[PDB]
Structure 1
Amino acid sequence: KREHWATRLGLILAMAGNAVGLGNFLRFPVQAAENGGGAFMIPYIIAFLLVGIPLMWIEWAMGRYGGAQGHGTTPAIFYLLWRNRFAKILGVFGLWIPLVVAIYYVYIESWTLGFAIKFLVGLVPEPPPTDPDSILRPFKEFLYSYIGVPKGDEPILKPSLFAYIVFLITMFINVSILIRGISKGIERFAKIAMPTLFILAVFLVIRVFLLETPNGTAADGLNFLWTPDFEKLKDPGVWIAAVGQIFFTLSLGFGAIITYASYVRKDQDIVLSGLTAATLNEKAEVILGGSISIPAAVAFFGVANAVAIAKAGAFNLGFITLPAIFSQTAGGTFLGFLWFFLLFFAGLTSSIAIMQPMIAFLEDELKLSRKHAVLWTAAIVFFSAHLVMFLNKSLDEMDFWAGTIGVVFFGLTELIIFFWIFGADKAWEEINRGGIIKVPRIYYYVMRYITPAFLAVLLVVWAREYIPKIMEETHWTVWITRFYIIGLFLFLTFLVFLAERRRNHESAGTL
């Protein structure tokens, strides 16, 4: 009774949409810009080869394996691979991480829809005729008024009425797709969204490549991004940034690739399919995402200033700088619309992917109907999102624990359980089974020894030289978000406990 992807194309575009999202167009540019541009790319490429690709196959394999037995989420799948109560508990992260990411990701996605709407109808700011700030300030105030940045000392946000309603609409749109299921919902939408997304992105790159000012050209932006710095490879922070981006952009460690793969027929290839999805994401990221905002910013403000803007972070580059720059060109407001529409489709195809794990768990383990599973999941995300919408820095806290530390920790966890506990040879066999192509021989040793060792070191260095400076150097309000998401973990563990009991009570009625 489990759904399955209808076509190979659909599967590939759905998986591609899972990966290609806000991380490609917003996160990548910031990470690369603040880490030296080209100096970021070497570790990034290496991370993609030693972590991205191998974990992608591992997650597809685990998902297809679990699906064959009617399970699409990690609490059950981890137990199938390691029959130990602790496997179910660690598996909870496969529901918690995607749920927590969704709680702030859908909200950011809603901003892009709201901006798309306002830019389409021309309800945007109008700067004067060369001073930077005189042009950027109006756009900064525009964003600040939208999300309600604090004007006082209280760490409280005051979202505009329009932003709140657009978030509601955004949740509604995510639900309209998810409620139709895998083949008729997610797959059908991906076939529409991905082509649209690709065309919009190419057009924007072309337009940005035409940008030129007394300060530079788009070419200067590209040179900054693709010019190596072999003297930065010794910087740990750059590696942590690169690996973190690889996980986020490929949706690895979210339990999302696994859940999507659980709808792939038991015999269907995952080697070539997985590699293709990963390659598509990388193209969209380094070629499309990398060629839009960085080159535009560099062309208008020069490299030094572009970098400063990125380090200023706070969504400056994508929500303030790029539109401000576009406003200086004929048809620039429409150009802004295209940008935000692109971001919206990129985010939407990814948010449905990160919400599906909770949906699958409720359907697979608690036996809820798809309708009910989708509605309760949306309700939980909608409610919880109020924390991100009203408490300044809550978004940052969730993105750190789930979207940064969480995904890397879970990636290592799933690899250990699948390639070490379940059995390296059994895992290798499982990955290659039905493959249109075989995984290169060398990757067996990468998956069994290199990847885990690489991640283990990363995490160690991370928790010893970086985390401490946060667990003690933040406003007391970070504890509100920490308290809440720990509660979410507790609640999800309770649900796994209930699924466990329903299972036994149902098994007893069978014997």
Structure 2
Amino acid sequence: REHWATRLGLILAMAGNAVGLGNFLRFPVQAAENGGGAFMIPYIIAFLLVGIPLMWIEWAMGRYGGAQGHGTTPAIFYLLWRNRFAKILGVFGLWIPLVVAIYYVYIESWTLGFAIKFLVGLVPPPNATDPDSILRPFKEFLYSYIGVPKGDEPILKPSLFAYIVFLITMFINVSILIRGISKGIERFAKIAMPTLFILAVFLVIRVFLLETPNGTAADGLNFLWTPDFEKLKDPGVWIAAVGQIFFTLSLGFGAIITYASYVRKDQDIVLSGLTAATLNEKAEVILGGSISIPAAVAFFGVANAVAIAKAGAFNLGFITLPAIFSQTAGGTFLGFLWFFLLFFAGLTSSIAIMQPMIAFLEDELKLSDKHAVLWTAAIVFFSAHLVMFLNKSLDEMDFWAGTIGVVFFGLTELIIFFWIFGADKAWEEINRGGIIKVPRIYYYVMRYITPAFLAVLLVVWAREYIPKIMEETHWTVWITRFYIIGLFLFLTFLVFLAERR
């Protein structure tokens, strides 16, 4: 079995796994939408009660599985619980990361496309000071890029350039993964993560120097870091915080598990896992949280920044922020650095959520690494055409896989590992070879708190918010639901072919 060559490489690979578009696009929107500081107390608590414990669990299961030649959950789940149902629930460890990849890589290609056009200057005056005169040209620049529908039809007509940039983006993803763990993912991580950190820090400093009559970047930080306990009784804020923690740490994706399956059997995962987890949180709340919010707050104020955030998941990062930069000397180049930052962030994550299906084809169907990557890329490239042309197919998959799916799977893997497999032997697996030991308090959190917190969260979620979306959507949501259900059954069938091999 291939293994990471260095501890540093492993941590940066796993840090590049987590540090992605979630840190710089999702977290700002989630935080701004929920009162900044009002959002971070749940966020901090969710990290300590969900994020950290599940991080260790996923490392442990991956390492455990890798030791026996299996880095994906269909097999690992069966190793932890020899029941045919374990293999079927294990399929979600392939389905979630594949479905998330189908639209993640596309949004990743936007950041590359934008970056190219901002670098070359093919982008949309301060003499005009009315705001909408500055934001509309960037709204239209994005809407024309991805082809937002103008008429009654729910169809997207993405640019030719966007389509081509998508092809290039997958070619880049394949270029890395086709070289393996050590010489591929690990080598790119050691380059991308330094670059990512330097770009983010530079952007943070340029943003902190933004000042306008409606505020400063400082007002954005005090809005983000001013505690508030009015909404700590609000279910929506807790479910947003826990959803964000799952997504940003790549938990419930099966991706952490697959990476960890390439860690040597007796090599530490306790400190390593905690380091990658904490590195992502620093990149999230200090870098991600100090670019978009302070910029929008400084230029528009908090009320209008909160409105912008509520406007959409891409309004802030793809429209508002470049619009703000455009009012700065060299702002188009600053835009380039922002989207280049976003690209390396997403690319380091997209390669990680595609390797689960790659490792399944290598480990269970015994495909060569080369063919495993190409077939995986073809599956993602083809399926992405749903996301590229059907309006809001992106949202439907991000909901079932990237929001409901991750949480459901996170609770499933915990139950399999810590209840059925055995809390005491799971605890042994986590700490075996640990440089440090997991705080013994966390044994009880992982066994009783984390599952209760996720279980309670999923019912107040499933029987309150989702009946709304499950009843009055446009019929085209069924197209995406139909397709990703077919995907699940296709993967179930490969698991069936792998069991009988």
Query: With structure 1 as the length reference, what TM-score do the two structures score?
Result: 0.97
User: Distance in 1 between the 2:209 and 2:126 partners?
Assistant: 21
SS at match of 2:295: helix
User: Distance in 1 between the 2:499 and 2:14 partners?
Assistant: 38
User: Distance in 2 between the 1:487 and 1:173 partners?
Assistant: 27
Partner of 1:509: 499
Distance 1:461 1:510, change over 3 A: closer
User: Distance in 2 between the 1:354 and 1:191 partners?
Assistant: 18
Mapped contact 1:128–1:134 kept (Cα < 8 A): no
Runs of 4+ off more than 2 Å: 126-129, 508-511
User: Distance in 2 between the 1:404 and 1:510 partners?
Assistant: 33
Mapped contact 2:70–2:261 kept (Cα < 8 A): yes
**CA deviation digits over 1:355-390, x for unaligned, max 9?**
000000000000000000000000000000000000
Q: In the alignment, is residue 178 of structure 1 matched against residue 177 of structure 2?
A: yes
Mapped contact 1:272–1:437 kept (Cα < 8 A): yes
Give 1:230 shift: 1.0
Mapped contact 1:127–1:138 kept (Cα < 8 A): no
Distance 1:46 1:198, change over 3 A: same
Give 1:126 shift: 6.2
**CA deviation digits over 1:217-245, x for unaligned, max 9?**
00000000000111111000000000000
**CA deviation digits over 1:471-491, x for unaligned, max 9?**
012111100000000000000
Mapped contact 2:220–2:302 kept (Cα < 8 A): yes
Partner of 2:47: 48
SS at match of 2:467: coil
User: Distance in 2 between the 1:509 and 1:107 partners?
Assistant: 33
Mapped contact 2:292–2:316 kept (Cα < 8 A): yes
Mapped contact 1:128–1:135 kept (Cα < 8 A): no
SS at match of 2:153: coil
Mapped contact 1:127–1:134 kept (Cα < 8 A): no
Gaps of 5+ in 2: none
User: Distance in 2 between the 1:346 and 1:438 partners?
Assistant: 30
SS at match of 2:75: helix
Q: In the alignment, is residue 495 of structure 1 matched against residue 479 of structure 2?
A: no
Mapped contact 1:244–1:408 kept (Cα < 8 A): yes
Partner of 2:367: 368
User: Distance in 2 between the 1:462 and 1:491 partners?
Assistant: 28
Mapped contact 2:26–2:313 kept (Cα < 8 A): no
**CA deviation digits over 1:398-455, x for unaligned, max 9?**
0000000000000000000000000000000000000000000100000000000000
Distance 1:111 1:127, change over 3 A: farther
SS at match of 1:265: coil
User: Distance in 2 between the 1:474 and 1:268 partners?
Assistant: 49
Q: Following superposition of structure 1 onto structure 2, how do residues 66-145 of structure 1 map, counting pairs within 5 Å? A: 66-125=65-124, 129-145=128-144
**CA deviation digits over 1:28-66, x for unaligned, max 9?**
000000011110000000000000000000000000000
Partner of 1:31: 30
Query: With structure 2 as the length reference, what TM-score do the two structures score?
Result: 0.99
User: Distance in 1 between the 2:25 and 2:313 partners?
Assistant: 11
User: Distance in 1 between the 2:330 and 2:96 partners?
Assistant: 40
Mapped contact 2:29–2:313 kept (Cα < 8 A): no
Distance 1:128 1:496, change over 3 A: farther
User: Distance in 1 between the 2:488 and 2:221 partners?
Assistant: 42
SS at match of 2:313: coil
User: Distance in 2 between the 1:11 and 1:461 partners?
Assistant: 37
User: Distance in 2 between the 1:102 and 1:230 partners?
Assistant: 36
Give 1:129 shift: 3.5
**CA deviation digits over 1:121-156, x for unaligned, max 9?**
000006754110000000000000000000000000
SS at match of 1:233: helix
Mapped contact 2:309–2:316 kept (Cα < 8 A): yes
Give 1:509 shift: 14
Partner of 2:297: 298
User: Distance in 2 between the 1:60 and 1:271 partners?
Assistant: 8
User: Distance in 1 between the 2:212 and 2:469 partners?
Assistant: 40
Distance 1:126 1:181, change over 3 A: farther
User: Distance in 2 between the 1:385 and 1:487 partners?
Assistant: 14
Distance 1:510 1:476, change over 3 A: closer
Partner of 1:262: 261
Distance 1:372 1:307, change over 3 A: same
SS at match of 2:469: coil
SS at match of 1:379: helix
User: Distance in 2 between the 1:434 and 1:51 partners?
Assistant: 23
**CA deviation digits over 1:260-314, x for unaligned, max 9?**
0000000100000000000000000000000000000000000000000010014
User: Distance in 2 between the 1:411 and 1:128 partners?
Assistant: 52
Q: Following superposition of structure 1 onto structure 2, how do residues 130-209 of structure 1 map, counting pairs within 5 Å? A: 130-209=129-208
Mapped contact 1:58–1:415 kept (Cα < 8 A): yes
Partner of 2:225: 226
User: Distance in 2 between the 1:311 and 1:155 partners?
Assistant: 22
Mapped contact 1:211–1:296 kept (Cα < 8 A): yes
Give 1:510 shift: 14
Mapped contact 1:126–1:138 kept (Cα < 8 A): no
Mapped contact 1:64–1:258 kept (Cα < 8 A): yes
Alignment identity in percent? 99
How many residue pairs get matched?
Answer: 501
Mapped contact 1:25–1:343 kept (Cα < 8 A): yes
**CA deviation digits over 1:184-224, x for unaligned, max 9?**
00000000000000000000000000000000000000000
Mapped contact 1:37–1:225 kept (Cα < 8 A): yes
**CA deviation digits over 1:311-340, x for unaligned, max 9?**
001410000000000000101010000000
Q: Is 344-353 or 127-136 further displaced after alignment?
A: 127-136
User: Distance in 1 between the 2:134 and 2:444 partners?
Assistant: 54
**CA deviation digits over 1:48-107, x for unaligned, max 9?**
000000000000000000000000000000000000000000000000000000000000
User: Distance in 1 between the 2:204 and 2:3 partners?
Assistant: 36
User: Distance in 2 between the 1:354 and 1:69 partners?
Assistant: 21
User: Distance in 2 between the 1:455 and 1:325 partners?
Assistant: 39
Gaps of 5+ in 1: 499-507
Mapped contact 2:25–2:313 kept (Cα < 8 A): no
User: Distance in 2 between the 1:130 and 1:213 partners?
Assistant: 12
User: Distance in 2 between the 1:386 and 1:338 partners?
Assistant: 28
Mapped contact 2:81–2:421 kept (Cα < 8 A): yes
SS at match of 1:3: coil
Mapped contact 1:74–1:91 kept (Cα < 8 A): yes
Distance 1:319 1:127, change over 3 A: farther
User: Distance in 1 between the 2:446 and 2:332 partners?
Assistant: 48
